[PDB]
């Protein structure tokens, strides 16, 4: 059974709640990014309206194939009506297409789902500054003091930096990365621009980065694996028997593999910094762990929150357990009182 923190009050609205068949009393649902945990349940087979990014939109009528009229996109920043309620959609600063949802009630209660975001100052220039907000349903992926990591551009840096250097030594070298979803586009692609290559990727891969609206996209990436020597691989088959595998196909055109695992959190973020990183090495292969994230680390969301000063937060993540919940409420509280609202 869907649960409250699905819903949205006073609306037929839920959101990012596709698993548990039809919610009675739902008009619409809304779909915050393309990630399975919030897709999980569509397919061709659905036929309610859905609301979502131009992006997420290409995603659902391209892989997993809904048909057309039930996929409603809708421009960001952009007061729109749905059902005769206001809604604003804003980007996110998750992965490739992911909003945050401004739903304005008819009874003057303004509610903000911020579905998975990154947390960034810039946010506070758009048009959450215009007006107060009562509800915030809030991804409390990383609340706890514990949880700091670098910033994007600290953790781009050094993967081009790292690359750059072990292709100029042995130009004989090839680089992995490793994905499973979309999102952290950007690891791939920034280091394939300081190697003067593009990135080669199966079929499947490729499929999904052609949906994503990137600009000047058709020469970045290639299916051609032979062509390319930055290659994208599934996160699981990135270990030492996975590589010397994938190492044997290529087919002695590279004597060396330099592989990147962009990860989230990991427990060495409590001891040790970004140019302080060192690889797993056995032979010839080399893996980086980066911490490259795109959730909010403990200190951006607590900034958020203080400058947003909503009435009330509902956590969308790490709900399951009561010890979870009762100390997110902790440092909820903490919050308020330090900033006096
Ligand atoms: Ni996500």
Same mark, same amino acid.
């Given at each position: ?140 992926? @990383?609340?706890? %003091?514990?949880?700091?990591?670098? =910033?994007?551009? &600290?953790?781009? #840096? !050094? ?128 893996? @980086?762990?980066? %911490?490259?994230?795109?959730?909010? =680390?403990?200190? &951006?969301?607590? #900034? !958020? ?37």
């Amino acid at each position: 059974t869907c649960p409250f923190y699905k819903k949205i009050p006073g609306t037929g609205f839920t959101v990012d709640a596709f698993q548990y068949g039809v919610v009675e009393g739902c008009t619409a649902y809304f779909l915050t990014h393309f990630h399975s945990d919030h897709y999980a349940g569509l397919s061709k087979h659905f036929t309610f309206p859905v609301y979502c990014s131009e992006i997420t939109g290409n995603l659902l009528k391209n892989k997993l194939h809904v048909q057309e009229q039930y996929i409603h996109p809708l421009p960001l920043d952009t007061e729109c009506i749905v059902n005769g309620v206001k809604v604003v959609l804003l980007d996110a600063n998750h992965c490739p297409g992911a909003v945050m949802i401004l739903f304005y009630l008819p009874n003057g209660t303004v509610i903000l789902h911020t579905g998975d975001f990154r947390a960034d100052p810039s946010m506070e220039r758009s048009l959450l500054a215009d007006q107060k907000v009562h509800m915030l349903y809030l991804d409390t992926t @990383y609340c706890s %003091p514990e949880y700091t990591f670098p =910033s994007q551009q &600290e953790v781009i #840096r !050094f993967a081009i930096n790292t690359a750059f250097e072990a292709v100029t030594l042995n130009p004989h070298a090839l680089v992995v990365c490793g994905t499973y979803s979309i999102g952290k586009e950007k690891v791939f692609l920034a280091i394939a621009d300081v190697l003067g290559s593009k990135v080669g990727m199966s079929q499947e891969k490729y499929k999904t980065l052609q949906c994503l609206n990137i600009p000047e996209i058709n020469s970045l990436i290639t299916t051609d694996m032979c062509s390319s020597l930055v290659h994208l691989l599934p996160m699981m088959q990135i270990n030492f028997k996975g590589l010397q595998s994938h190492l044997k196909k290529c087919g002695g055109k590279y004597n060396q593999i330099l592989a990147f695992r962009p990860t989230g959190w990991t427990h060495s973020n409590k001891f040790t910094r970004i140019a302080d990183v060192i690889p797993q090495t056995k032979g010839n292969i080399s893996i @980086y762990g980066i %911490p490259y994230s795109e959730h909010s =680390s403990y200190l &951006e969301m607590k #900034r !958020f929150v203080q400058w947003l000063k909503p009435q009330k937060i509902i956590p969308t993540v790490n709900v399951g357990t009561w010890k979870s919940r009762s100390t997110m409420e902790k440092y909820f509280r903490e919050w308020k009182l330090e900033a006096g609202y």
